């Protein structure tokens, strides 16, 4: 009875999505001229990790960037001069995510230890020590992002997300509803709402203040590994293990466009956007990072040069450079 | 060209590089072992023998060789996503209990826990990330298994076994079935040892299997394999 009601309601929502769509996005955006071949040359090569890098995050000053490695190290890098600024030894070697604060005071990290470590960088003593440890997730942490210097949203492998208060140490808001492991999360520029994708081939848009699921986007065939908001904040691209990428609009509430090609069958580790948003950058398991034209679903460039599986990719706030991290322990900056 | 602060920053970067190289060498000498099995296998007991939420890390030093053992049993999450982290592992120590076949989980569909352990070992062995990784197989509760095979025949759980009731024959048959679960015999050794209440005998077998793995890695590094 309740299941039949759910089937009826989802059929009505599917009919509303069908009736709402009138013109294909590719047909409308076919008029604009193509950008052409975009070639990005390596500027800097970062070395000394000596282990499998999993996560990088750009700072808001567009110069410093944090990186997380499997040897138990967070390395904070000066990207212009190639010098290392900080080297934080970690209590647990197994790490899967790291966040750099917008102010630059704090660095978060997390992984298979079910603990989120917050490190203060502006201490008077001069040694980066453990400031605050978040604790209470029943699954492995997959992503963390600093909304503010006191509040942080983390996603975990117990199908849950949480909004934590750093000074208190307790979790304030708990987001539940996903049936699969939530693999990533992305913050909109306003920071009022955030979308997160899970291993049930769905993404969900959660309002922070409300604490309830604002929207739900389905359409993928496999586990969603990456998610990223557009600069305007009304759209977000998702990457999944089914060798396809998708673009979802919040207001339209339907699949705008699909990025895929026949030769590539491997998954999408990470996705990001440029400052304009015209170019969608995504690293795949084929040892490459492909730059797609977002408005025409065509490939604009290929970034080859990593010798192992590319794990993470990040565009800086001004958009001057793109830094990719791969499993060969080399961080490469492409301009 | 560079200012004094820039030169001091370069000197700081060189000191950090020296510390990272020293830490990388110290981590490179360490032998990593991944511990797997069911909850009822007896992981805690054998870890306490070898010593004397998330990842449980055990540090011990045998014959001037450092071992770090990673117990992943606490996590309830899907294994497929976080299993790729353990790609660079020397060996997987997989522990199961011989007495599991009589024990049955409280489910509407009566299922043998031994077949669940067989499915778990088949899933770990046929994993794409673990093709050249050796498995050290530990069979637990030998005395209770002997008392049980004396008290109850092994024919009841699966009809395929027609051997006469014998502890040695039943143990050999379980061992050869576990070895037959392997689908790539040439590139993956399976070391089967019956667990006993002796601290020396287990750790020495683990040391011998790790020594064989280091021999294999050194021969691959030199280029013979």
């Amino acid at each position: 009875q309740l299941r039949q009601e759910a089937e009826q309601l989802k059929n009505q929502i599917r009919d509303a999505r069908k009736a709402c769509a009138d013109a294909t996005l590719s047909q409308i955006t076919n008029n604009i001229d193509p950008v052409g071949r975009i070639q990005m040359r390596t500027r800097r090569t970062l070395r000394g990790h000596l282990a499998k890098i999993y996560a990088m995050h750009w700072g808001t000053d567009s110069r410093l960037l944090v990186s997380a490695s499997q040897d138990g190290k967070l390395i904070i890098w000066d990207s212009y001069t190639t010098n290392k600024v900080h080297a934080i030894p970690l209590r647990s070697s197994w790490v899967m995510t790291c966040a750099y604060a917008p102010s630059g005071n704090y660095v978060a990290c997390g992984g298979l230890d079910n603990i989120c470590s917050i490190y203060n960088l502006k201490t008077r003593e001069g040694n980066v020590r453990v400031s605050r440890e978040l604790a209470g997730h029943t699954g492995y942490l997959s992503c963390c992002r600093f909304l503010d210097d006191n509040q942080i949203v983390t996603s975990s492998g117990d199908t849950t997300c949480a909004l934590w208060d750093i000074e208190t140490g307790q979790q304030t808001t708990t987001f539940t509803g996903h049936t699969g492991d939530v693999m990533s999360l992305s913050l909109a520029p306003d920071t009022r709402l955030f979308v997160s994708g899970a291993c049930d081939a769905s993404a969900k848009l959660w309002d922070v203040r409300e604490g309830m699921c604002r929207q739900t986007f389905t359409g993928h065939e496999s586990d969603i590994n990456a998610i990223c908001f557009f600069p305007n904040g009304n759209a977000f691209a998702t990457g999944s293990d089914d060798a396809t990428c998708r673009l979802f609009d919040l207001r339209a509430d339907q699949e705008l466009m699909t990025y895929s090609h026949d030769n590539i069958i491997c998954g999408i580790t990470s996705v990001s956007f440029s400052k304009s948003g015209r170019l969608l950058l995504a690293g795949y398991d084929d040892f490459n990072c492909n730059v797609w034209d977002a408005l025409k679903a065509d490939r604009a460039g290929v970034l080859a040069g990593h010798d192992n599986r590319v794990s993470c990719l990040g565009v800086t706030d001004d958009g001057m450079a793109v830094a990719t991290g791969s499993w060969d322990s080399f961080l490469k900056i492409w301009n | 060209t560079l200012s004094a602060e820039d030169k001091a920053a370069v000197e700081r970067s060189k000191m950090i590089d020296r510390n990272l190289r020293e830490d990388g060498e110290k981590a490179a000498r360490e032998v990593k072992l991944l511990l797997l099995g069911a909850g009822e296998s007896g992981k805690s007991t054998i870890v306490k023998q070898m010593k004397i939420t998330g990842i449980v890390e055990t540090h011990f030093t045998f014959k001037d060789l450092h071992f770090k053992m990673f117990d992943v049993g606490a996590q309830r999450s899907e294994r497929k996503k976080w299993i790729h982290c353990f790609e660079g592992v020397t060996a997987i120590i997989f522990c199961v209990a011989l007495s599991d076949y009589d024990l049955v989980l409280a489910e509407d569909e009566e299922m043998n826990r031994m077949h669940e352990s067989m499915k778990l070992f088949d899933s770990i062995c046929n994993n794409k990330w673990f093709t050249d990784t050796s498995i050290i197989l530990f069979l637990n509760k030998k005395d209770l298994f002997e008392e049980k095979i004396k008290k109850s025949p092994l024919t009841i759980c699966y009809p395929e076994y027609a051997g006469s009731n014998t502890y040695e024959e039943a143990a050999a048959y379980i061992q050869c079935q576990f070895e037959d679960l392997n689908k790539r015999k040439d590139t993956k050794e399976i070391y089967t040892h019956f667990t006993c209440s002796t601290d020396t005998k287990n750790v020495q077998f683990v040391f011998d299997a790790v020594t064989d793995v280091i021999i294999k890695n050194n021969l691959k590094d030199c280029g013979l394999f």
Partner: single-chain antibody
Amino acid sequence: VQLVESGGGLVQPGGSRKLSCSASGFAFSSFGMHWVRQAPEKGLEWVAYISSGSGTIYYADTVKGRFTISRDDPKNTLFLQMTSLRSEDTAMYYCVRSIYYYGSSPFDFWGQGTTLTVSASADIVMTQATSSVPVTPGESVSISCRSSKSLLHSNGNTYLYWFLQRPGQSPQLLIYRMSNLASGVPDRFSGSGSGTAFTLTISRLEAEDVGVYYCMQHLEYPLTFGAGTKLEL
């Protein structure tokens, strides 16, 4: 964070003396150390620098040879060896910790000072044009500094630091790199200007700000200080 110096007292000329500065409550091994001297009725003067890990060592040209600087990291002690002292060395010596990276605030913490009395590339000249300005509490105060060489480096940083020494207390850092305020300094102070012409503006003058203001270049060794603008009421 605390630095205390020992080894003071009167010294005969031509003798030798070994000062020791002990550090507490911070990672001594990661900070570079500066020795700064101050005459009784004159301005400050830089003596020496040792990097963290003892990789590079710098001296002023007037103190080259006679003064030896060392450090012991397991005991967290900075050692200064002085041989063949002269009549110009009757000064108070301060120890300074300084860390150098992108976004760091060097010269932030100053020692307490040990008194020693003895009884019988072009050097960038920093010019304090004025010597004393009588001020009233409440008005905005302007202090001017000038250089002999353009401190604007090609990376965009201008290596000018503003220090305040209160009467009878250790000097504190106010401004590093002419724009950024040091941690713990109120927003009353602001630095502005360009190459060869720098200005410190104190809007809403408040008590305990009376002291001597120093402008320091940090473009190249040896470090040269200013004369020191003193305020009064």
